[PDB]
Protein: Insulin
Organism: Homo sapiens
Amino acid sequence: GIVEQCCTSICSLYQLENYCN
Amino acid sequence: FVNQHLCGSDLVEALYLVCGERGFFYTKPT
């Protein structure tokens, strides 16, 4: 999930955008 | 944007910040 890439690793906006519904 | 370790609260808010109305994978208000 978004948590692994962002919390376990550093994410990117685009990666954050992917999860916007 | 930024290069930080976001987790739930910080991340979710990061999404509500990024996604905004589109909502996002976690739990919207209601």
About this structure: The two ends of chain B are 27 Å apart (CA to CA).
